[PDB]
């Protein structure tokens, strides 16, 4: 049976790394509603005009989406204006960051891990294949008005932004609480990260070798850990399917003698063709409207993700959020962002307690008619003596008048025990 | 008239409980577009195929929603992997939790309060009535392709999750800052919750009886307080209305001689029936598309709520958020989650100051040419003497050299007063 | 080259003000689907009924949006129940708030800045022009079923709410951590805002004149700084465009002999008119459905913004969020909300470090075989002597036994230096 004076306190700990993947953006596309609905046909074009402004409005809606996609990327990545140069030391206290930092030997300045992500995530190809030089109208005709737009920010630009966000200000002064995760005086920076989670400084300095070894090992595990990227792979598959719908639907003779305008204008009287053409226009218009509606709703989902990604970057990467399970499970220490196809990947570094054991505890200690409360932390018994220590790491200290405060009375507190508080001044007087 | 040296400090306080209700999920449904649009008719089916892939795509969209609904529930509740057993003490320091914990005597292991919520919130019935054994195709035909899907997680499973989230780790070691709201050494756990809002430990230990009495009373009020659940009742009513739309619309002869396929095929020539059938297909398709669009938009709303509910659970239940009015109005102490039909209910426990009175204050005290600033809290005057105390509870202490720090000069600070700081060492030297 | 013992510490600072603009709400509108689709025509009305409940459902959807718009406003502004009176001092320690507080001499009780916003942001007019007395049906007919609804809360009411939120509780007791940004004992309130960002109290009291001067200057800059409000101007333009779509589309003879019902009923046989009318109904219905869909999606965007605005108000205005870049860039001190057309404007006051210089640092100091760690802050070298100071403002203090704690050993910490720790008791013993 469990009693009401038993506290579990960790005697050891480990450092772990978890991965979060967010779908910041999606491929920018545009559909020319006039070319999609009507091909090389004057009769179709004139009939389409008689249906009013539906076509024009749809172009507007899709354009707005394409613009938002660049806004999303900028809000997430364009937060730092640093250039980012090259660190001439390559040693941050035994810590290995060579796998998260840009590799100078590569064509594209990506880190090893970023490259793993890049080569993992796989209509758009066909459009890309018809182009290469700068003929967009030619391809648009081949693809029935469906075109693909370039991003505002290229892969190289994003890599530069993440290099600035991750490290940036390596050289020219450490900023303990006002800058990127990676800076030269790393051992100290960490000391003020442990403190931020209720772990005193000595814990880091006395265990630098163990901690660095655990950290370096954790990174290696991430490379093998990386399924995994299905969350971003889904982005491409979902968008490709939507485009496939538009293309296939053009072959549907929606109550029509055919799906080909030329086979309606030919071998058919004027008013007969007008009716058949109108039927195809009505169906193709309905199809396009369905597509656009789906894109508007989907785009909203990606916008929400982009906002979250930007928020987490500010609070997890360029800060130390204390929100539970917000920057990963456990006690947040830091985050190292990485670029990825259509999204951002965060490597969250957290502190995890280990090897807990229950010790006997008490509310307060009665010294001489007065109740002494712990200034910080808890009181624990090792079976023969009472000590005062912290909650996130077991390290008993002698209970003295400088570790407690006095309030109320011995006869008021219920869980009061009889122990002795040490007065450090008496030996100095004598 | 008010002066510029008047600070209001609470001399008393109360503990209050507020209720938050969130619509985490909605009933999972599915519509067979082929059966809905076309019944037992070959002619209708063939004509529907001529309209392309519209029907297929709509099935896809609705299926995606049904899946998301289980994801939403899992993100909110499936955060803890504890089993949750039975506490053999039933006494947490005079605190009564019998009304929030599962009742062993019930068929369904719900708490008393959970049961109140369960029996408060009230097409779906009719479908449920035709089934009972496992005949789904038979009902689907009766209900024109409209069917209802079961949840991944049953009510019993949710009750178990909330039991783990609320308490879970009652026996086998208290985890002061790394576990559920309810653990055996409750009086102490609370001490470190009061501290978390700037209220020193003695406040709790000297007032355990009053605090427990207020807490127990507050819970009783909640039972009578529980309108109230309209927020979740709306979920059922909104969804039922949407389904009613689809059913009723089938009776609309949208520019047709009838709304019954059999009355079109009968007493009508082949090409005449084809036209009339196409008109009904076009209308029924438009109706179904309207329905699906509404479900996609609505589903997005519920997804946002589920994400918020999950976030609050992590930060309010399995932590102590300091975000203002995030976990309820006042100073957050803890939260006790409860299950509910189509949602989650949070009972937020907050600290509320009472019986404030304004005292005269000052920036700093001049002792001997040097300005002494409060180490923590404020300086106050009782009319004849100056004392130092905290801000969230009035408890005057003697101003000593250990309660202040020295900076600047007496002649620099504007709101400087002439008082005396007590030096605790002199009596020891003499 | 940079070394691994260099810390940049600010020797000066400035106070800055940034502006955030949020689109809380949008104009409430309603469309009478029956009047829009069918004008003064019995034949059109009867044919519309034959299409079922589409028309009715659309009215429902738009109504729901109009209601949500008032909910959005209430959640953001209706958080405080104070009356707000008049401060008879007009002096908060040299700080000038006359430009953010309501001006008693104006017809509408707005602040100067609020008035700048009001007169900056510019179908709806035409409807507003036909009315003035309370004839809504007359205008509705003139505008083809398109009407405009009044807000629940008028401009005056909002101004009163923001006056309560900004100041409210000026007279009758200061509430250091439980009330609005503006209260009489401002110099002290600020002291506990600087402390909240790791800046000790003396920093404010010794620099009141400089700080007040910077603050007052910053406000003047905002007036000239106020493009700018494009974010809210877009709200009107986007909504106006959507309404223009509905109006223009009524002129489209969507496969019809005309767009005028009277020109179809006249000079045409009964069954011929029925067909032509049905074509117009189908197009006008499709147009209305398109409009409503766009409004539902757009409304969701504004709902998200309203929720964010309300959240920030609680955490930024009625609190001191520590979330990075959440309440503005830099260290958050306070926020002063202002009303605006269709939205809310926040003036964020932040602390920004200035004039940094790198000092030489070290992990710990070895005194006599034992390692002394800083109780708070960092150790720095001025080139000849070691001092201990804080991180957000350079102010060296003598390193004493009361500024450090002892842990581990001299021979364990790597970055250990040989310095002397001062013992303050020896001079008292002698
Ligand atoms: C805390 O846990 C770590 C990891 O288990 C312990 O480090 C291991 O110590 C053993 C014995 O010296 C070595 O053989 C292993 O190689 C170490 N592992 C690693 C990754 O270095 C550490 O000793 C434990 N600390 C305490 C106080 O028990
Ligand atoms: C940091 O990690 C990198 C990558 O794991 C290490 O580089 C590898 O070192 C081994 C051993 O010499 C070689 O066999 C591999 O071929 C190297 N890989 C690459 C990509 O160069 C690097 O040595 C580690 N540095 C430290 C200080 O631990
Ligand atoms: C609780 O801690 C105390 C202090 O470390 C332990 O007492 C010491 O035990 C060591 C090892 O036998 C002796 O060399 C010291 O002289 C003892 N000091 C004192 C003041 O007695 C004590 O044994 C521990 N209790 C338990 C159950 O482990
Ligand atoms: C803690 O110390 C107090 C004070 O010495 C103890 O209380 C006394 O106990 C004796 C023996 O039962 C009584 O005769 C005295 O009258 C008590 N004095 C008071 C003021 O109560 C107390 O029992 C000790 N507690 C423990 C656990 O040792
Ligand atoms: C703080 O407020 C509480 C609640 O009003 C006070 O508790 C009451 O005290 C009176 C007088 O002893 C009793 O008759 C009531 O029954 C108590 N109420 C409850 C719920 O127990 C408490 O005394 C006040 N504290 C102070 C210092 O004034
Ligand atoms: C905790 O609350 C429960 C429910 O209010 C209390 O149980 C009730 O006790 C009264 C008085 O004996 C009975 O008349 C009711 O019939 C009981 N209700 C139920 C559901 O059992 C319980 O006694 C309270 N326990 C404590 C320690 O306060
Ligand atoms: C301010 O507090 C002081 C200290 O409690 C009060 O002075 C004491 O008053 C009591 C009751 O008359 C006396 O028994 C003590 O001897 C007094 N102590 C001292 C040092 O004078 C003082 O009266 C309070 N002032 C007001 C206005 O309430
Ligand atoms: C606080 O103490 C200071 C120092 O004793 C007082 O300042 C002196 O006041 C006398 C009388 O007006 C003057 O003659 C001295 O020249 C002043 N000395 C200085 C350095 O200013 C001060 O007035 C006292 N304040 C209060 C409120 O008692
Ligand atoms: C911190 O920066 C402020 C602003 O630059 C300095 O204030 C200026 O000081 C000069 C010299 O006395 C005056 O001529 C300017 O008019 C002041 N500016 C303002 C706005 O008042 C301040 O002196 C600097 N502090 C330190 C220690 O260097
Ligand atoms: C606070 O700011 C207001 C507005 O800038 C100041 O009022 C202006 O004062 C100047 C100088 O006397 C006049 O020329 C302007 O016409 C005034 N404007 C208005 C709207 O009244 C006010 O004096 C400032 N107060 C303080 C203490 O700085
Ligand atoms: C580091 O700070 C110390 C203490 O202020 C400086 O030493 C003082 O310098 C002043 C000006 O020359 C002398 O009047 C004091 O007597 C010195 N005090 C001591 C203990 O030497 C020291 O010069 C500063 N070092 C540097 C490089 O600026
Ligand atoms: C800090 O003080 C220690 C202790 O005096 C110094 O260590 C000694 O240095 C001398 C000279 O090299 C050696 O002969 C002793 O054997 C060392 N003693 C120990 C325990 O190591 C240390 O060198 C000093 N460091 C600095 C930077 O002054
Ligand atoms: C609860 O604590 C009291 C006081 O120490 C003790 O007497 C009682 O046995 C404890 N309960 C259990 C089940 O151990
Ligand atoms: C608590 O004590 C029990 C009994 O010794 C033990 O089985 C359990 O593992 C302890 N809890 C922790 C966290 O060590
Ligand atoms: C503001 O404080 C000063 C200094 O104590 C005082 O002289 C003045 O009367 C106070 N103002 C009011 C209205 O009381
Ligand atoms: C502040 O003082 C006035 C005057 O005595 C009083 O009416 C008011 O209630 C006091 N404020 C508080 C919070 O007690
Ligand atoms: C890093 O710190 C060590 C120890 O003080 C020093 O010897 C080394 O030169 C420093 N590295 C650089 C590049 O200054
Ligand atoms: C760091 O030192 C270098 C070299 O003197 C200097 O150029 C740089 O400005 C310093 N960093 C800061 C923040 O002052």
Author numbering:
A (entry chain C), B (entry chain A), C (entry chain B): 706 to 827, 833 to 844, 847 to 938, 943 to 1146
Q: What is written in the article reporting this PDB entry?
A:
Coronavirus S glycoproteins fold as spring-loaded trimers transitioning from the prefusion to the postfusion state, upon receptor engagement and proteolytic activation to promote membrane fusion and viral entry. This metastability, however, constitutes a challenge for producing the S2 subunit (fusion machinery) in the prefusion state in the absence of the S1 subunit. Here, we set out to design a prefusion-stabilized SARS-CoV-2 S2 subunit vaccine enabling robust elicitation of antibodies targeting conserved fusion machinery antigenic sites to limit the impact of viral evolution on immune responses.
To further improve the conformational homogeneity of our vaccine candidate, we designed two additional constructs comprising either 4 or 9 additional residue substitutions added to the E-31 trimer. Both constructs were recombinantly produced to characterize their expression, stability, and structural properties. The E-60 construct harbors all 9 additional mutations we selected to add to the E-31 scaffold. Although recombinant production of this protein construct led to high expression levels, its cryoEM structure at 3.5 Å resolution revealed that the introduction of several proline mutations in the region comprising residues 879–897 distorted an α-helix and following loop relative to its native structure.
